[PDB]
Amino acid sequence: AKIIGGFAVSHTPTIAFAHDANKYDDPVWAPIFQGFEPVKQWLAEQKPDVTFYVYNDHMTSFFEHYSHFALGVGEEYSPADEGGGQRDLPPIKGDPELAKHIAECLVADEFDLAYWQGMGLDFGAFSPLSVLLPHEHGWPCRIVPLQCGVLQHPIPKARRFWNFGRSLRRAIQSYPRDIKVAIAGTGGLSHQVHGERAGFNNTEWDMEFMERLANDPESLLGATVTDLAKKGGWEGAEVVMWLLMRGALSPEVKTLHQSYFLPSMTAIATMLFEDQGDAAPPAESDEALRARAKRELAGVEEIEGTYPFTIDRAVKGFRINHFLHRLIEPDFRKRFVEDPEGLFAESDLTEEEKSLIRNRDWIGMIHYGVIFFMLEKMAAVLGIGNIDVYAAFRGLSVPEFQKTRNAAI
Amino acid sequence: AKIIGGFAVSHTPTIAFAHDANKYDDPVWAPIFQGFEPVKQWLAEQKPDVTFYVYNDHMTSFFEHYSHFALGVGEEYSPADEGGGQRDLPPIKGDPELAKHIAECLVADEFDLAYWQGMGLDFGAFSPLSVLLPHEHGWPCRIVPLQCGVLQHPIPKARRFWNFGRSLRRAIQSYPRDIKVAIAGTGGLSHQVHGERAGFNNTEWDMEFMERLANDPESLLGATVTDLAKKGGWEGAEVVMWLLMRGALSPEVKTLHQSYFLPSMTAIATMLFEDQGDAAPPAESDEALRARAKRELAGVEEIEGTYPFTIDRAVKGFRINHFLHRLIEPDFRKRFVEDPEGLFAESDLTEEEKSLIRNRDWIGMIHYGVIFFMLEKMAAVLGIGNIDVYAAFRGLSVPEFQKTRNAAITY
Ligand SMILES: O=C(O)c1cc(O)c(O)c(O)c1
Ligand SMILES: O=C(O)c1cc(O)c(O)c(O)c1
Ligand SMILES: [Fe+2]
Ligand SMILES: [Fe+2]
């Protein structure tokens, strides 16, 4: 519930490559890693419990279904295979409870979201995190990733990215736990990596952008995609993600550190911001925002025999739901019927999860967090009509359930 | 550019079952199919060019990544395998041009979207569509699907679905083409298909909801998920999709038809709404809306050597982007290096597309509609540094291009 501050850093994959190759005293790379140092120190000293991490996926985990604001709600994240195998880094833990609270708040404020679990984080995340945080066996903090669809136009306007951050601030502050949260905005600065214009940079615009983001961020909010692409290059226009992070910080921040280097394609820049707290009370109190974020499902627990599929339940039921979802694949479902045990022994299912499936325990799976539409698939594959499932839910014989209907179908 | 009207219809998979199992003379189902006939007849007579189709996917094509408003921008859609194999139905054609226009207007109005291509439509689409439209060889109209994330809470508020509809109305009207567009809201009405409460229905609420939706829809906009699940069953609360559709129509509509049947788990309902056009001119003219939708990329064409990855480009490059995306799979990329010609023959790639990859024609791929991030994967798989790709883009040798860099470095 306390925002300690925020940081901005480029996420170009070269940072990771330079790290993995130990170019720490290379004449080109030495002052660059030195640029990351104050951010690295601040993080080790401040010890945030969670980093809210704003990034974009580079057509790896997001392609055929490509969303604007994709909130990671899952228990943990591994490095994505980008075509060269997964980087050797430990998984980083997520925060389902914080992510759900944020989703509730952001939807109440009429932002439209996507929710995701299980997919890998590409270089947009693990390039800068691997240089910012020590990771021998695990990571020093949890993450809540926000993957932003900045690559397929139209994308949200600059002012929308900013307004998301403003609502995000209130969301994090109203979270009823005494934790410390840092916000990260990544990508940028100037660059262009496609077409005959590949290699464009604008150091002059970069410095201006940094200054304005720090000290007058509102003056950036009228910039169009054309403006940002003209000034910073096509891919450099991803800096709207910095705006989102900056919007989540206090209107006035202190700049603890800032650096800038351009050795090759991308302006590798870093900024560190110390949150100053609120200069005045927010328009709506923490207690009031909490009540408002809960109003949609207020009193839902008074509906008996009902198990609303909320984010917490989706996380709880994720392994078993993911498993049953695979029944839409011809080979998997053939195996489910002929050799279920061989399929179980290969899975990551708990013994209890296997047991629920083997027993065809319909109501138990619902209690546990399986969504009905996965059971529907399971029933179909096993030759079991939906009527059987409903009868089990109700504790009735098939005919006695059928009696509650107007016609037996 | 002309909204002729809209229909509301249940999407329960049981409609497809009865249809496929040929049940038009069965005593239970015959009257039900007769309930669909006024909507079927109106579609056949009115001949919309496109139906804007509002539905939800039932954890089939949308699961690990689950979005609120998922707009289908692609060229065609096939039935999804839902665990029983693909229903035997032909592909239905999309409308990428109208989809792109709609996206531009909606983002300008600050709705946050998802774009998708190539994935199957589950029963949410093909159940009612198969009874409403003839399809033995092909479909009579195009579709623009909008898959709504109604299953994983928090979901957008009722008023948000309605405001989406209001903005969608203007988006379709301002589309500079002389076409007829029908709007479909699907799902509902009362039902609950999970838990000890499974089997719940509420016919009185169903009728009142429909009457209010037809004649006073703004009286519904303060309904919470709890209100809607209490009155209509947990899954019955998806009727916010009906609201979105209703939001897209004239403030006054003529309700040509209403039917209602409850044989089993789901209140099977139909409504046909004739659009009454606009009583007064819109708050913002069509001309002004077109310009505002275009103002984010206004003047981007002045930027040389640049190829904005817009929806039209994402559609054009879809097959080749999708192919090169698969390089993230260990088995596919080993095959790419070891037997590319074999991989090509099994693919759906046109010869133009295969040739581009075969020649490692980097700039030609960018011109074609391949996004750089797919070429980055291809380069890496073949052991080529990004530096060679960039030099190829600039029409320079590696050494020549390196000179433009402050430091000539390796990666
Ligand atoms: O090859 C590079 O320097 C490079 C590759 C990327 O994918 C990227 O996003 C970037 O900013 C730079
Ligand atoms: O077995 C059923 O009647 C059934 C199954 C579904 O997946 C569904 O959405 C529905 O409204 C009814
Ligand atoms: Fe990026
Ligand atoms: Fe549905």
Residues A76 and A94: beta-carbon distance below 8 Å: yes
Chain A residue whose CA is closest to B365: A195
Could you give the CA distance from residue B125 to residue B133 in angstroms, rounded to a whole number? Answer: 12
Q: What backbone torsions phi and psi does residue A275 show, to the nearest 5 degrees? A: -70, 140
Residues B34 and A77: beta-carbon distance below 8 Å: no
B248: contact with A, CB 8 A cutoff: no
- Other Cβ atoms closer than 10 A to B289: 22
Compute, in angstroms, the gap from residue A79 CA to the centroid of ligand 1: 18
Could you give the CA distance from residue B197 to residue A303 in angstroms, rounded to a whole number? Answer: 9
Environment of ion ligand 3 (residues, CB < 5 A)? A 56, 187, 238
What radius of gyration, in Å, describes the C-alpha atoms of chain A?
Answer: 24
CA angle in degrees (0–180, nearest 5) for A120-A124-A125: 65
**DSSP one-letter code for B55:** E
Contact B83 A328 (CB under 8 A): yes
Q: For strand A2-9 and strand A180-186, is the pairing parallel, antiparallel, or unpaired?
A: parallel
Contact A84 B380 (CB under 8 A): yes
Beta bridge partners of A70: A114, A147
Q: What backbone torsions phi and psi does residue B225 show, to the nearest 5 degrees? A: -55, -40
List gaps in chain B by the residue before each (C–N > 2.5 Å): none
Could you give the CA distance from residue B76 to residue B279 in angstroms, rounded to a whole number? Answer: 36
Q: Which two tokens stand for residue A388?
A: 């059987």
Q: Which domains does chain B have, with CATH numbers?
A: 2-304 (3.40.830.10), 305-411 (1.10.700.10)
The shortest C-alpha distance from B5 to chain A (Å) reads 26
**DSSP one-letter code for A395:** T
Q: How many residues does chain B have?
A: 411
The shortest C-alpha distance from A196 to chain B (Å) reads 4
For A:365-384, CB contacts with B below 8 A are 366, 371-374, 376-378, 380-381
Provide, as residue numbers in chain A, all residues whose Cβ is less than 8 Å from the Cβ of B370: none
**DSSP one-letter code for B191:** -
- Contact partners, residue A208, CB within 8 Å, separation at least 6: none
Could you give the CA distance from residue B332 to residue A83 in angstroms, rounded to a whole number? Answer: 10
Is residue A57 classed as helix, strand or coil in its secondary structure? coil
Residues A386 and A405: beta-carbon distance below 8 Å: no
DSSP run (H or E) holding B143: strand B142-148
The shortest C-alpha distance from B199 to chain A (Å) reads 8
Could you give the CA distance from residue B278 to residue B254 in angstroms, rounded to a whole number? Answer: 13
Q: How many CA atoms lie within 13 A of B285 on its CB side?
A: 3
Residues B116 and B75: beta-carbon distance below 8 Å: no
Tell me which amino acid residue B129 is.
L
CA angle in degrees (0–180, nearest 5) for A249-A255-A261: 115
Residues B74 and B147: beta-carbon distance below 8 Å: no
C-alpha distances in angstroms, A287 versus A175, A281, A284? Answer: 10, 13, 8
Lookup result for tokens 């944020």: A102
- Count the helix, strand and coil residues of chain A and give each as a percent rounded to the nearest 5: 45, 15, 40
Environment of ion ligand 4 (residues, CB < 5 A)? B 56, 187, 238
B56: contact with A, CB 8 A cutoff: no
Q: How many residues does chain A have?
A: 409
- Count the helix, strand and coil residues of chain B and give each as a percent rounded to the nearest 5: 45, 15, 40
For A63-91, b/e burial (b = at least 16 CB within 10 A) is bbbbbbbbbbbbbebbbbbbbeeebebee
- Other Cβ atoms closer than 10 A to B102: 25
- Contact partners, residue B96, CB within 8 Å, separation at least 6: B73, B74, B75, B311, B312, B315
Tell me which amino acid residue A174 is.
S
Provide, as residue numbers in chain A, all residues whose Cβ is less than 8 Å from the Cβ of B405: 199, 263-265
Could you give the CA distance from residue B285 to residue B308 in angstroms, rounded to a whole number? Answer: 28
**DSSP one-letter code for B178:** -
Residues B154 and A107: beta-carbon distance below 8 Å: yes
Burial class of residue B53 (count of CB atoms within 10 Å of its CB; 0-12, 13-18, 19+): buried
Is residue B118 classed as helix, strand or coil in its secondary structure? coil
Chain A residue whose CA is closest to B363: A195
Q: Which two tokens stand for residue B27?
A: 């005593």
The shortest C-alpha distance from B47 to chain A (Å) reads 30
A213-217 CB contacts, 8 Å cutoff, 24+ apart: A213/A8, A213/A242, A213/A243, A213/A246, A213/A271, A214/A253, A214/A255, A214/A258, A214/A271, A214/A273, A215/A255, A217/A162, A217/A243, A217/A246, A217/A247
Among A184, A174, A169, which Cα is nearest to A52's?
A184
Could you give the CA distance from residue B163 to residue A14 in angstroms, rounded to a whole number? Answer: 44
**DSSP one-letter code for B372:** H
For A:197-236, CB contacts with B below 8 A are 197-199, 224-226, 229-230, 234-235
B133: contact with A, CB 8 A cutoff: no
Among A148, A291, A160, which Cα is nearest to A220's?
A160
Exactly one of B97, B104, B238, B353 is catalytic; name it: B238
- Other Cβ atoms closer than 10 A to A344: 17
Q: How many CA atoms lie within 13 A of B14 on its CB side?
A: 22
- Contact partners, residue B210, CB within 8 Å, separation at least 6: B8, B189, B258, B260, B269, B271
Could you give the CA distance from residue A50 to residue A177 in angstroms, rounded to a whole number? Answer: 12
Peptide bond into B189 cis (omega under 30): yes
Could you give the CA distance from residue B366 to residue B372 in angstroms, rounded to a whole number? Answer: 7
Residues B226 and B300: beta-carbon distance below 8 Å: no
SS3 for B196-222, per residue? CCCCCCCHHHHHHHHHHHHHCHHHHCC
A330: contact with B, CB 8 A cutoff: yes
Tell me which amino acid residue B210 is.
M
Provide, as residue numbers in chain B, all residues whose Cβ is less than 8 Å from the Cβ of A263: 405-407, 409
Residues A58 and A189: beta-carbon distance below 8 Å: no
Contact B404 A13 (CB under 8 A): no
Among B10, B223, B55, which Cα is nearest to B148's?
B55
- Other Cβ atoms closer than 10 A to A380: 17
Exactly one of B58, B82, B104, B353 is catalytic; name it: B58
Is residue B153 classed as helix, strand or coil in its secondary structure? strand
Catalytic residues of A: 11, 58, 191, 238
Chain A residue whose CA is closest to B114: A67
Tell me which amino acid residue B28 is.
V
Q: Whose CA is nearest to atom 1 of ligand 1?
A: B386
Q: How many CA atoms lie within 13 A of A338 on its CB side?
A: 6
Among A29, A269, A192, A187, which Cα is nearest to B404's?
A192
Strand ordering across the sheet containing A50-55:
A253-261, A268-275, A2-9, A180-186, A50-55, A142-148, A69-72, A114-116, B65-67
Of the residues A266, A296, A300, A331, the best mutation for testing chain B's interface (the one with the most B CB atoms within 10 Å of its CB) is A296
User: Residue B360, by phi and psi: left (phi above 0), alpha (psi -120 to 50) or beta?
Assistant: left
Among A40, A210, A194, which Cα is nearest to A129's?
A40
C-alpha distances in angstroms, B282 versus B27, B244, B278, B288? Answer: 48, 19, 8, 11
Beta bridge partners of A98: none
- Other Cβ atoms closer than 10 A to B65: 22
DSSP run (H or E) holding B323: helix B318-325
- Contact partners, residue A286, CB within 8 Å, separation at least 6: A1, A173, A174
**DSSP one-letter code for A110:** T
Provide, as residue numbers in chain B, all residues whose Cβ is less than 8 Å from the Cβ of A262: 406
C-alpha distances in angstroms, A207 versus A157, A225, A340? Answer: 22, 19, 60
C-alpha distances in angstroms, A344 versus A288, A327, A347, A354? Answer: 47, 13, 5, 7
- Contact partners, residue B379, CB within 8 Å, separation at least 6: B385, B386, B388, B389
- Looking from the CA of residue A373, the nearest atom of ligand 2 is 7
Tell me which residue in A28, A153, A199 faces B309 most closely, judged by beta carbons: A153
DSSP run (H or E) holding A345: helix A340-346
- Contact partners, residue A287, CB within 8 Å, separation at least 6: none
Q: Which two tokens stand for residue B337?
A: 């290096």
Ligand 2 proximity of A97 Cβ (cutoff 6 Å):
no
Residues A127 and A16: beta-carbon distance below 8 Å: yes
For A:144-203, CB contacts with B below 8 A are 149, 151-157, 160, 163, 192-199
Could you give the CA distance from residue B278 to residue B32 in angstroms, rounded to a whole number? Answer: 34
Contact B196 A224 (CB under 8 A): no
Could you give the CA distance from residue A270 to residue A275 in angstroms, rounded to a whole number? Answer: 16
Q: What is the dihedral of CA A315, A320, A323, A325, to 10 degrees?
A: -70
Could you give the CA distance from residue A51 to residue A325 in angstroms, rounded to a whole number? Answer: 31
Q: Which two tokens stand for residue A95?
A: 């925060």
Among A45, A43, A137, which Cα is nearest to A88's?
A137
Residues A321 and A370: beta-carbon distance below 8 Å: yes
- Contact partners, residue A348, CB within 8 Å, separation at least 6: A319
Residues B201 and B237: beta-carbon distance below 8 Å: no
Is residue B144 classed as helix, strand or coil in its secondary structure? strand
Q: For strand A114-116 and strand A69-72, is the pairing parallel, antiparallel, or unpaired?
A: parallel
Helix axes A372-381, A318-325, angle to 10 degrees: 40
The string of DSSP letters for A63-91 reads: SSEEESEEEE-SSEE-BPP-SS---S-PP
Could you give the CA distance from residue A44 to residue A113 in angstroms, rounded to a whole number? Answer: 32
Q: Which two tokens stand for residue A74?
A: 């899952």
- Contact partners, residue B66, CB within 8 Å, separation at least 6: A114, A115, A116, B149, B151, B152
B335: contact with A, CB 8 A cutoff: no
Beta bridge partners of A254: A274
DSSP run (H or E) holding B148: strand B142-148
